[PDB]
Amino acid sequence: DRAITVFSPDGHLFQVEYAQEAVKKGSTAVGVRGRDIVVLGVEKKSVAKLQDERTVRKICALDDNVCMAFAGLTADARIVINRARVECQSHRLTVEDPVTVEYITRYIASLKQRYTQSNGRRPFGISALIVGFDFDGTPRLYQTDPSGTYHAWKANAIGRGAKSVREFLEKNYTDEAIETDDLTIKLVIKALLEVVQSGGKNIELAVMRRDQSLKILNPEEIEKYVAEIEKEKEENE
Amino acid sequence: GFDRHITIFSPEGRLYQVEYAFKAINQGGLTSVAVRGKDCAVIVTQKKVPDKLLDSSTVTHLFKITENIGCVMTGMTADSRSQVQRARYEAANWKYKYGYEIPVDMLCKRIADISQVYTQNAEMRPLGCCMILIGIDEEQGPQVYKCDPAGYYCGFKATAAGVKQTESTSFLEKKVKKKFDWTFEQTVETAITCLSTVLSIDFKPSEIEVGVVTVENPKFRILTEAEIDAHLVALAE
């Protein structure tokens, strides 16, 4: 019938709905709060022997205290990061205080809403999600639907297999299991590990320790944390 | 589809819109004849006047674009007047930009370029009017040219446009194949007898309007009733 940016006879916005269903094509993305550290992972499983793994860039920083991850179209996501990064540098230029996570998420949501508006612009079929420590200590996580909206979540769980991983997170999202940085990281694992095989090195985790720079976990330490998760799984017969 | 609805190339490799406009020239019920001679060029077209409530003073299809170039229009009258106005503007602009008067061939080229722009793009449509323009040109003698709704500007010696243009062109081809130059009596008589054989009404000296440009006498003379009557009497003798 009609699949353009106009209201349908039953309501809704079918082009926006199609964009919102396009995130399913992509990859899983999990991340949590904890007042000590925000950690988010992607778990990409596609690397040929001839492609360099440096330029996958599934997680990227904005202002060394804000980082975002992919779920959906990669080119649209990269354009979003470029524009958002420009806007964070602008909001660092004016208003000399560093950017807040809510402000940049609001800007990203506003850009997505603007692109959904009018028939000319394709509605940016990317679902972004942003973590990071604010200026006033508190680390926060917001998840932005492609249409126009952002929501502050304790767990994001966006991408392929989003429903199952979100159910697992909300099932056992224990703050006592959050506590320490290591506990937080090991809670993100065994939750993202649940998605697909996750066997050798598929997990691609990211770390933001309060005021430290964006930490990308080394593969050997990732395997160490996987072994610790296995040890916790053991002795539970 | 819409191959035959808009100015786009057909799947067979043709352009149907201009092919329809050329027949639009045939629509309207009129004919014109242009004959170049040894020293002059004359154009005659019938003056179809339904009822005498019209002003035969202004029902003409021939006009003065400049002091030495005269056109005759075939097709829809509105597009004909628009193209006449455009030609007058082009002649004036050429005389302003370049001191010498605009050559008739250059004016035809500019009008044909405008028509080619019209058949280009899709917002506008070609003008359904074919213009035959004549004028004396130094170092060239009399000159006659035709600009069509497509943009192909050409034509010489004897050229006709209108509903029964094919028969007139055939008779003029027979006449020009007869190798004898036409003076400033034979050119006019040849044009008159051509248009009379095309439409046998004996041409009472009120239903045609002839324009003449000679070499010794420049300017586009719209010959009056007395002149056309005298030429008709001389021919029918």
């Binding site: 920083a61 904005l62 202002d63 060394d64 470029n82 990064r85 420009v86 964070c88 540098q89 602008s90 660092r92 230029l93 | -």
Partner: protein, 196 residues
């Protein structure tokens, strides 16, 4: 009427700047800082007309930070200096030229320390040493007299104290304190502010 100075050593750039901002009769901030941390190893000095210096220095700094965030690796000091000059020269011919006077310094892992000089016309130039302001006319001679291309950090601090003491002894406006920062391979190192 301000003061900027920079000295390029074998593996470092030592830069000092005055810490006064005034209103033509009176200084209102003895703690004014005009060091601009362009990146982890690039530092900028911008003196001149009020506000215009702040606007230009801030804009160039934020563009450099945007480049660092957008590529992961920071700009080379030479590239940063060339970009700064290009932007200033583009603004010069515009309706709103930036009457900013600059002194850009930085360290690179491959070419070592770097120091660049340019004026409100945006004429970039690389020099081992460069003083800037009304005090340049007073201290450039001391720099050229007591500078060798193999000056260590302690000797550089000694020469910088020499020229600052000359400025205090001979220059008209009081400059009670100066901010001293050194750029090297480890990054930006700030030294104790020199006062009198």
């Amino acid at each position: 009427m301000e003061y900027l100075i920079g000295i390029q050593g074998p593996d470092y750039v030592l830069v000092a700047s005055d810490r006064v901002a005034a209103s033509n009769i009176v200084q209102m901030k003895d703690d004014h800082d005009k060091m601009f941390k362009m990146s982890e190893k690039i530092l900028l000095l911008c003196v001149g007309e009020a506000g215009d210096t702040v606007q230009f220095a801030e804009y160039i700094q934020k563009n450099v930070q945007l480049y660092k965030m957008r590529n992961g690796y920071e700009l080379s000091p030479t590239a940063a200096a060339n970009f700064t000059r290009r932007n200033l020269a583009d603004c010069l011919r515009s309706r709103t030229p930036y009457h900013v006077n600059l002194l850009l310094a930085g360290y690179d892992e491959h070419e070592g320390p770097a120091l660049y000089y340019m004026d409100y016309l945006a004429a970039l130039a690389k020099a081992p040493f460069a003083a800037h302001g009304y005090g340049a006319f007073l201290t450039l001679s001391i720099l050229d007299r007591y500078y060798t291309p193999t000056i260590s950090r302690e000797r550089a601090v000694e020469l910088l104290r020499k020229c600052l003491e000359e400025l205090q002894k001979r220059f008209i406006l009081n400059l009670p304190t100066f901010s001293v920062r050194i750029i090297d391979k480890n990054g930006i190192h700030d030294l104790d502010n020199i006062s009198f």
